């Protein structure tokens, strides 16, 4: 379960850099220079690392310190052969972000937000990025009346709107990821699952530039099924990246690394981004524990891709498995994949068979077969056939 730059995984350089900052505790590690990040990630195995323009730029640098900092980053990548996949902005720290970014009622905020993501769109396809996300974390409210929520809609098309202008003007090929969050650090948060993201996309003027980036613990943390709407992300063409890490069921935001949290989640949310081919980067955005040193956030960084890896040979295994393929079919999940009526609807109509003569009592008497189904599905993570 050694993995390889092969493998795709990726990880934010405020994850591994996380100084364990917590709303009732001050740091409990030193920050973290990208550069040496850069190397460690690499000597794991992972094939890239990601970046909020505040990561990698300290906020308010002049335009020498700027190109000092990417320098050394630059320099970090060609010596390790790292990649940068995907890149962000900061729209949360600074208190000027503190009723949001895109929708501060603040006209002004909302300008400087839509600058300041520019600018680090630039920067991330210089880079080489291919994706471009957009975490709304300060969307939103702790009041009903603070937050209209249908002009900060607005507010919120206008923006990305801006954003696919803007990057169809310069000729770029990078693509546009909205991660969703439901609450934290706002009481509510805007597009608050991948529901309201995909929904939302589909009224922006160009939303073939626009997907989801789901986290596995902020869908959890609305008692979502992660891997249900993983694949609502998938049926509609829009997993253009992945988020993974841990969270254990509805409580505030724990980025634990990949595979602790929900296991069995994990495992289904393994089995189907392979069964999909999903083909995007695997990035990790976990917090090492504040509790662990900078020997416990590598063990942390690497227990996320070996977890991955586990996963993947184990859903793997599950669906090469004659047994468990009888057993799919017992439960009739060839039937869900064909059509309900490729005969058409007035075919349909006619046909007696599906009402008239249709026997009810008899279809309902026939058992589904899930659990044991389920079952040689635990026997195959548990390593136990
Ligand atoms: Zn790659
Ligand atoms: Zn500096
Ligand atoms: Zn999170
Ligand atoms: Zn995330």
Redesign the pocket.
């Known amino acids: 379960y050694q993995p390889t730059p092969e493998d795709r995984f990726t990880f934010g350089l405020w994850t591994v850099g996380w100084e364990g900052r917590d709303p009732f505790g001050d740091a409990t590690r030193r920050a973290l220079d990208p550069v040496e990040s850069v190397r460690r990630l690499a000597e794991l195995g992972a094939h890239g690392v990601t970046f909020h323009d505040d990561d990698l730029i300290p906020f308010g640098s002049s335009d020498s310190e700027r190109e000092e900092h990417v320098k050394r980053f630059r320099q970090a990548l060609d010596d390790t052969g790292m990649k940068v996949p995907m890149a962000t902005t900061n729209l949360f720290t600074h208190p000027v972000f503190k009723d949001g970014g895109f929708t501060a009622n603040d006209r002004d905020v909302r300008r400087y937000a839509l600058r300041k993501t520019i600018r680090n769109i630039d920067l991330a396809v210089e880079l080489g990025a291919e994706t471009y996300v957009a975490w709304g974390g300060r969307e939103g409210a702790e009041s009903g009346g603070a937050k209209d929520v249908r002009d900060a809609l607005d507010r919120m098309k206008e923006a990305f709107d801006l954003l696919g202008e803007y990057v169809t003007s310069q000729g770029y090929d990078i693509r546009f990821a909205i991660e969703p969050?439901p609450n934290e650090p706002r009481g509510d948060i805007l597009l608050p699952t991948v529901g309201h993201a995909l929904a939302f996309i589909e009224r922006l003027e160009r939303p073939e530039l626009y997907g989801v980036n789901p986290?596995v613990?902020?869908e959890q943390m609305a008692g979502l099924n992660f891997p249900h709407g993983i694949a609502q992300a998938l049926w509609a063409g829009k997993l253009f990246h992945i988020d993974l890490?841990g969270?254990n069921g509805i409580k505030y935001?724990?980025?634990l690394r990949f595979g602790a949290g929900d296991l069995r989640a994990a495992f289904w949310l393994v089995d189907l981004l392979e069964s999909a081919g999903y083909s995007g980067p695997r990035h990790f955005?976990f917090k090492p524990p504040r509790t662990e040193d900078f020997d416990g956030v590598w063990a942390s960084a690497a227990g996320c891709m070996r977890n991955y890896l586990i996963l993947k040979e184990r859903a793997a295994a599950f669906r090469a498995d004659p047994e468990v393929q009888e057993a799919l079919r017992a439960s009739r999940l060839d039937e869900l994949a064909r059509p309900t009526a490729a005969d058409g609807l007035q075919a349909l109509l006619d046909d007696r068979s599906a009402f008239e003569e249709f026997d009810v009592d008899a279809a309902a008497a026939r058992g589904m077969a899930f659990e044991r189904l389920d079952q040689l599905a635990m026997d195959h993570l548990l390593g136990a056939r």
Do not use: A, I, P, V
Request: charged share 50%.
């Open positions: 969050k986290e613990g902020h890490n969270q935001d724990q980025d955005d």
